[PDB]
Design a protein around this ligand. Sequence first.
Ligand SMILES: CC(C)=CCC/C(C)=C/CC/C(C)=C\CC/C(C)=C/CC/C(C)=C/CC/C(C)=C/CC/C(C)=C\CC/C(C)=C/CC/C(C)=C/CC1=C(C)C(=O)c2ccccc2C1=O
Ligand SMILES: CCCCCCCCCCCCCCCC(=O)O[C@H](COC(=O)CCCCCCC[C@@H](C)CCCCCCCCC)COP(=O)(O)O[C@H]1[C@H](O)[C@H](O)[C@H](O)[C@@H](O)[C@@H]1O
Ligand SMILES: CCCCCCCCCCCCCCCC(=O)O[C@H](COC(=O)CCCCCCC[C@@H](C)CCCCCCCCC)COP(=O)(O)O[C@H]1[C@H](O)[C@H](O)[C@H](O)[C@@H](O)[C@@H]1O
Ligand SMILES: CCCCCCCCCCCCCCCC(=O)O[C@H](COC(=O)CCCCCCC[C@@H](C)CCCCCCCCC)COP(=O)(O)O[C@H]1[C@H](O)[C@H](O)[C@H](O)[C@@H](O)[C@@H]1O
Ligand code: HEC
Ligand code: HEC
Ligand SMILES: *C[C@@H](COC(=O)CCCCCCCCCCCCCCC)OC(=O)CCCCCCCC[C@@H](C)CCCCCCCC
Ligand SMILES: *C(=O)CCCCCCCCCCCCCCC
Ligand code: FES
Ligand SMILES: [Cu+2]
Lengths: 219, 147, 312, 115, 223, 139, 157, 92
Amino acid sequence: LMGGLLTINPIWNLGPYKPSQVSAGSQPDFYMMWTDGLIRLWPAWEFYPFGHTIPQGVWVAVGMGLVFALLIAYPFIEKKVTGDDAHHNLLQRPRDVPVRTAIGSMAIALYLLLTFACMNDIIALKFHISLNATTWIGRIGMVVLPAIVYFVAYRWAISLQRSDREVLEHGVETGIIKRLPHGAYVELHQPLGPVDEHGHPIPLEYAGAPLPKRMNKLG
Amino acid sequence: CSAGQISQTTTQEPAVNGVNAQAGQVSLRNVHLRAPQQTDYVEPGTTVELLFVAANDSSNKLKSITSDVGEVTLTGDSTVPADGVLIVGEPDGQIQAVTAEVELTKPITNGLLYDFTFTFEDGETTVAVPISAGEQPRRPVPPAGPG
Amino acid sequence: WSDALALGWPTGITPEAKLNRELWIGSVIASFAVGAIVWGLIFWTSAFHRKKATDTELPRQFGYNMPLELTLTVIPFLIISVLFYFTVVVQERMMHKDPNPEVVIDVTAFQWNWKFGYQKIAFADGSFDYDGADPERKEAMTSRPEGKDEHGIEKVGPIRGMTPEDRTYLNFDKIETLGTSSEIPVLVLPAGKRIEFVLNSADVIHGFWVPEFLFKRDVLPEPKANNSDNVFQVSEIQQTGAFVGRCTEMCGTFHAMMNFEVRVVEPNDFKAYIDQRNAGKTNAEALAAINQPPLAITTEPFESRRGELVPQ
Amino acid sequence: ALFMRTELAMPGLQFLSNEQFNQLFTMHGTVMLLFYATPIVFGFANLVLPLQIGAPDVAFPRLNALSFWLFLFGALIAIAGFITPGGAADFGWTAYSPLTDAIHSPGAGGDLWIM
Amino acid sequence: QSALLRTGKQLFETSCVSCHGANLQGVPDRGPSLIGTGEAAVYFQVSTGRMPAMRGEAQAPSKPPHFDESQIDALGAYVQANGGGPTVPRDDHGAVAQESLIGGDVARGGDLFRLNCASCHNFTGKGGALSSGKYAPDLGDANPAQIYTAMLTGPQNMPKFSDRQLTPDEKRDIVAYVRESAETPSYGGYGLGGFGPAPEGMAMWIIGMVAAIGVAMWIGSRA
Amino acid sequence: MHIEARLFEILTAFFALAAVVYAVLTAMFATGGVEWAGTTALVLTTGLTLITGTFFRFVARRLDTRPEDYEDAEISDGAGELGFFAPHSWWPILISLSFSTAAVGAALWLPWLIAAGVAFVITSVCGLVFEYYWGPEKH
Amino acid sequence: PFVKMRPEDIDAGGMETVFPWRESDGDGTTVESEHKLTEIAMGVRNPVMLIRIKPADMHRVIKRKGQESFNFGELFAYTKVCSHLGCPSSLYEQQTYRILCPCHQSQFDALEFAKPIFGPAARALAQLPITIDEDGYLVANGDFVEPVGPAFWERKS
Amino acid sequence: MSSTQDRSQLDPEVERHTGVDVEDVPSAEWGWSHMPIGVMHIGGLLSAAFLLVMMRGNHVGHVEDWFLIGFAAVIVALVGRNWWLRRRGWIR
Ligand SMILES: CC(C)=CCC/C(C)=C/CC/C(C)=C\CC/C(C)=C/CC/C(C)=C/CC/C(C)=C/CC/C(C)=C\CC/C(C)=C/CC/C(C)=C/CC1=C(C)C(=O)c2ccccc2C1=O
Ligand SMILES: CCCCCCCCCCCCCCCC(=O)O[C@H](COC(=O)CCCCCCC[C@@H](C)CCCCCCCCC)COP(=O)(O)O[C@H]1[C@H](O)[C@H](O)[C@H](O)[C@@H](O)[C@@H]1O
Ligand SMILES: CCCCCCCCCCCCCCCC(=O)O[C@H](COC(=O)CCCCCCC[C@@H](C)CCCCCCCCC)COP(=O)(O)O[C@H]1[C@H](O)[C@H](O)[C@H](O)[C@@H](O)[C@@H]1O
Ligand SMILES: CCCCCCCCCCCCCCCC(=O)O[C@H](COC(=O)CCCCCCC[C@@H](C)CCCCCCCCC)COP(=O)(O)O[C@H]1[C@H](O)[C@H](O)[C@H](O)[C@@H](O)[C@@H]1O
Ligand code: HEC
Ligand code: HEC
Ligand SMILES: *C[C@@H](COC(=O)CCCCCCCCCCCCCCC)OC(=O)CCCCCCCC[C@@H](C)CCCCCCCC
Ligand SMILES: *C(=O)CCCCCCCCCCCCCCC
Ligand code: FES
Ligand SMILES: [Cu+2]
């Protein structure tokens, strides 16, 4: 359906490659837009040793060699860091492991930044921004937005934990009844495990499962 | 940040050949040399014509000599600008009276800049005037034999 | 006392402005006579502190005082009723709409500067059989017999049959005191005549606001179509000299750069102004011909440059 | 407003330009009227009005989150004229129509202001 | 016609002399000079709509036109009589020629558009970004006479591809290309813009990959 | 209830009074004619308070005295079970992101972003309105 | 395909792309041509933009070393292949005078010498010397003084 | 009500002693849940140092260096506040 209904790589609209004519986009396919977007954002640091030249393109040749060496060898990295010397078969929900989800969301948002400042050209075209401004937005974003998304990701994973660690100590939330002889408002929680003789149940323990937070999703 | 203070629109030049000259109280815009350029240089003795406007910012109207090199002649209908223009001649396709023109006595070519000194009642300005043409398209180059 | 109590007006130069300034003086006397007794109420009910000897015993606790409420719902209605009657009796004296003016100025008001008209003069002293030109009012009524299709439509125009880019309201004149960006437009007006102002803007709403007329109006783009009685007469102008005139809506960026002047000259100076302009002279020459400084004297034509940190 | 008032302290254009000033009072008048006052008149409502009428919650308790988040994401996309190179709306908060139609103030910031 | 010059002057006085000084000069740091630019320049800069403008910004963008074809000839002949330069090409009716400008070749126009300028815009003539806020605009809403007078007198940041830089055969040839590249439909599907891989990526994710993950969550359960 | 019907009846009386007096005072006394731009705004703000007050009067007639609304009512007279309020929900943030994408497509005139933002509006509005109606997964 | 060039062709504020044609490899009407002639169109380090700076802006120019006479009045010839990573920098902005590249959006100053104003480039994009020939045609006054394409190890001594 | 309980015996583990307690984060034994905090302090400080090194380049617009000073001073202020509060035990 999307090979028929949507054009892709219209090479007749493009030209034959002659080395004196370009587009304005000149952007690669999206899975490699993080690479030369990293060219578009690395701030022109060249070195000049005794009679030679290290250009900018060394850095991303280091940098693509950097990220891949972090993306191949990550399980050994956090096997060294954490201490996971155990045969794990059950998964862990991505809220149950907040710094690893947060390092991952650093990597996701850094990819989204290096991509979303590789269509730098056509973003500044359509979404009317100065082109210098959006590549500075990328050039600061690859330094500060992983820190912002690490903070938001780590504390958001912990608050997703706490949001389904209060659905056990309390019930599952529903519509409101008032208490009869006085004026109160209880949310009429529906418990998930065994109940005691009064308004609170036996609080269950966590088990790595998605606990349902809507009585809707119950029967 | 691109909005006002150093704008990329009002800090511009018009896309035209001749230079401007704000100085000397005469607003002097698009001064160029119409010179049909036949060879490497245009040979000495060839009469080629200097074009500008001389707008007034008020009356400065005198046009004393305005000569650096090339024996600039003028026309007596020169006391025009009283907060107004001084259109010299037709620059390029101006279809609708001061034949300002130079007798070179120095080889000039297109692409260069030549220092002309326009003197007025208020002062003089050196402009580094260009060679221009809003002419017909290029004279036909001989097609080269292959080899 | 009369200038400082009036919250610092500029004093009037037309009887319109004199009577408007008298009503503002009376109305700030009314506003300070309300605010003085009510600030007296606040800064005297701040003498009802929590007393140190006041025991565990609450105040009078009253609320709900109906006759006092009727008195202070009737007395502000009396204040606004007498202020509304004085407002309407000064609203009668803002445009008397005299069909026999003495000089009509066609103040058109384009993007970021002014242009003054001198559409018609007629002295009751007896002078100036002068009129407006009108060959220049040609239309953009796009009554082409056929458009992009081939038959039937004969499309006439967007608004009322014509294009928006029309300019048929925009009346012109032989005399035109055009205002460039380095020379402030100088209207000159005879002292002690009936000076009508017909107001048009070529592009965008702004305001013909002389500060010392104590009056303004907005130059709406097509004011006859937009129910806008743009025209207003000014009854006299006693004081001669030069008077600033600002621009008092929003035009776009170069909006403080739209100042003008209404220099009020003697009637024989008005004679020697236009009779030294019918023989065609520009603004500085016509003002030099009547022994009066030609450039704008109460506002300089300030900088064509953009800031004090732009490199010239 | 402090930028505007640094600007008005001296008769020159000493600090920032003309056009940036005309963007400045406009975005200022909106994020004091339509993005500071106009939200807080329901912000104190969401504070203490169900507390004052005895309500357990506010009546449409997702649509109040929808009100707040539509407010914040109208406010960010109206401040987002400053990212644009010509800047935000130079016409005033009053935004009179021969100045706002796309012949006049043609930039992207006025459109972002509108939506 | 001298009355046409007077009409150009009447429209000139009441739209621009806050930024062109009314002697066709340049008001310094508020609007540049205007002589020598000519009738072709004023046709492109008012027929597109751009120059009856409202702020001096990164670049003055496109807008609806502030005058019509019965008045652009007046305004352009007025600026050519005060100055003088390139003129707009006109057919055997005296009006502005817009259909006689499409040249008899397209492939030469394709190669010449592609070499000489499509660095700035795009292959098919969509917009492209430029340095500090300025940007190339789309060529889809472009009258062919505006395209010829766009390359003939380059308004803002584009080189003026002159009568001698590109010959009028070549310029008619380029406007033959762009009026049949921004007009021909995208062969083989929706045209995700004209520039390829970034819209193709963003329409891979939310159209294709979001549908793929939605199918994958309808088929598999969750636990 | 009773008093909302009286409240919007007061607003209806004043809005209709102001609408008809603005129409008949701009019929005369104006420059060209009726203004037609605050006149119909006043006629339809009369329509606004007609709809609200007419519905509240329809409810207030088809009802007894509400145990809420009754003056001198003990809390135990009206202490039952209220209806469903929604607990925690992450759909309104998605409503706002969807409607903001549609709005910045309608601001920066990007028709692809208009269509995509409207598609996200439909998707997130479905996610809000079905949120307490999705049954369990049937496997 | 290659028409010989005069200074009167390009005018004020104009980018124009020039190629190193010679009198030997003539028109494309012989098979010994179109292979000395498409070799020019296929070689990477051949395209040179021919800038014609508006002569009101010739006081803003400051040349660099060994390069003061590489103008021709107001004709500059900067290469089209950029400083780093070799894309043709065929975007040119008059009235701001910046050679902008498309591939990574690196500006260069057309006025002084093509120093990078902004972008990921750090080297002056190379300038070609210009003279006019006998019969008044634009010719190159020698080679570039530096290697013209993208950077690599053996450079800058 | 149509749900069962959930019981998962994982391989629980440093081994449950040093890190974060199960009341700071509500599930610390279920995965790796504490970055050592000198890493994020020096990461923020090195981020701000990198933003300050980013002045060195092809550069004429000094309106950017105020953004770099600003986003570096914000990160230095957050890192310094955070380290000062842990040096005083979250006081003021
Ligand atoms: C998981 C994570 C990568 C951790 C790996 C470990 C990490 C420490 C290794 C080091 C990596 C660090 C140092 C540098 C980052 C470089 C980066 C990771 C390059 C590697 C390539 C690869 C692994 C990229 C990451 C994976 C990718 C981003 C996951 C997709 C995001 C999510 C989780 C999937 C669901 C999204 C799906 C439902 C569609 C939603 C729609 C959204 C708007 C899509 C976002 C989006 C995307 C993601 C585009 O790529 C894109 C490209 C072109 C145009 C537009 C878009 C676009 O809108
Ligand atoms: C999906 C929603 C995304 C929302 C993101 C919203 C963006 C956040 C705020 C952005 C502020 C942008 C202000 C830019 C305003 C500007 O134009 O400034 C320019 C350069 O400033 C800058 O970029 C510095 C600002 C950098 C911002 C810091 C980045 C923060 C990170 C966290 C945001 C990344 C978000 C990326 C999202 C990707 C997805 C992630 C999940 C000056 O250069 P320039 O204009 O070209 O030159 C001048 C002449 O024009 C002018 O005439 C002359 O006068 C001189 O001034 C001259 O220098
Ligand atoms: C069912 C039976 C089988 C029939 C086949 C169905 C397959 C479709 C192909 C059939 C031919 C239609 C393609 C037309 C030919 C074509 O190419 O489509 C243009 C693209 O234009 C536009 O966008 C406007 C279109 C707006 C419509 C809605 C947009 C589509 C959305 C839904 C795409 C989603 C993308 C993902 C969103 C990302 C999410 C973000 C959060 C529209 O042409 P047009 O409007 O007339 O003019 C052009 C000028 O748009 C153009 O700016 C100008 O430069 C010229 O190109 C001119 O020709
Ligand atoms: C098996 C080991 C793995 C290495 C694989 C490749 C190594 C192959 C070496 C074989 C050749 C050895 C020298 C003879 C080959 C030769 O003569 O050329 C050299 C060509 O070797 C190169 O490519 C690369 C090395 C260049 C020599 C020295 C490089 C290593 C040291 C010096 C760098 C480390 C210390 C400096 C800083 C280190 C990093 C940061 C601190 C240098 O180029 P160049 O110097 O530009 O000379 C030009 C003439 O070519 C041309 O004719 C003529 O026209 C000339 O004008 C000129 O252009
Ligand atoms: C914003 C106030 C303003 C308005 C109104 C205005 N001009 Fe412009 N003019 C400018 C500015 C600013 C530029 C800068 C764009 C440029 O020169 O590249 C300019 C440039 C031009 C150019 C391009 C010069 C060139 O070399 O390409 C033309 C043509 C032009 N103006 C004509 C007109 C015409 C005709 C009118 C209608 C009477 C008009 N302008 C209205 C200020 C204005
Ligand atoms: C920076 C290099 C640059 C290149 C080279 C260039 N353009 Fe332009 N083009 C622009 C810019 C910038 C504008 C907008 C100018 C303005 O708004 O005043 C523009 C305007 C236009 C427009 C008007 C679009 C509209 O909506 O009316 C068209 C058509 C156009 N160019 C086509 C061309 C043609 C034809 C060529 C020559 C073969 C060309 N471009 C070369 C940058 C460039
Ligand atoms: C011309 C420029 C002015 O620039 C200058 O002249 C000097 C530069 C100022 C120095 C910058 C200091 C800022 C430090 C950052 C601290 C931020 C708070 C903490 C962040 C971690 O004009 C401009 O560039 C003005 C800048 C425009 C500002 C746009 C405001 C944001 C708009 C919005 C679309 C951004 C998306 C979301 C932002 C956060 C939303 C929270 C709810
Ligand atoms: C560039 O063209 C923009 C022109 C106008 C810039 C004026 C900026 C004023 C301050 C805006 C503040 C926005 C939020 C900043 C958070 C501290
Ligand atoms: S490719 Fe043009 S500079 Fe990097
Ligand atoms: Cu104004």
